[PDB]
Design a binder for this molecule. Structure first.
Ligand code: HEM
Ligand SMILES: [C-]#N
Length: 121
């Protein structure tokens, strides 16, 4: 599984932690999290990614569209690209092989339509 190739639990915990340190230091997206407990957020993101990367059987939290559709200003590709960039940079900083980063980013890309609450075509 991509989850295992990445290093499993320890690796994903490390990635999520570094990821959110970048998120809160980036004015392009940090205000969205001003009323969020970032330890709880780290917990939920790990659980979602474990599922999305093939390390967990299911995800029982909010579906991605419900989770973001009501955030304001409405999310755009500027925000999506900012978050994707932070996750990619985190994996690079953690020494993940570029080919594994590519696979992880494809998983992230697959969430775009729902995360951005866009017409499903
Ligand atoms: C890159 C793709 C993204 C993924 C996979 C993702 C995933 C998630 C997940 C799993 C949750 C938790 C949902 C729950 O409560 O069950 C969440 C919450 C949230 N996300 Fe994202 N997200 C993404 C992008 C973004 C972007 C671009 C923003 C805006 C800058 C954003 C803002 C938020 C906020 C504000 C919350 C909830 C905060 C709270 O409940 O306190 N997310 N996201
Ligand atoms: C997204 N947190």
């Amino acid at each position: 599984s991509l989850f295992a190739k990445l290093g499993g639990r320890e690796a994903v915990e490390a990635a999520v932690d570094k990821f959110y340190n970048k998120i809160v230091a980036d004015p392009t997206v940090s205000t969205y999290f001003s009323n969020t407990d970032m330890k709880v957020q780290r917990s939920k993101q790990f659980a979602f990614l474990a599922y999305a990367l093939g390390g967990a059987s299911e995800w029982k939290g909010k579906d991605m569209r419900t989770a973001h559709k009501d955030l304001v200003p409405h999310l755009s590709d500027v925000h999506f690209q900012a978050v994707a960039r932070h996750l990619s940079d985190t994996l690079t900083e953690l020494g993940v092989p570029p080919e594994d980063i590519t696979d992880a980013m494809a998983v992230v890309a697959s969430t775009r339509t729902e995360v951005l609450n866009m017409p499903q075509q």
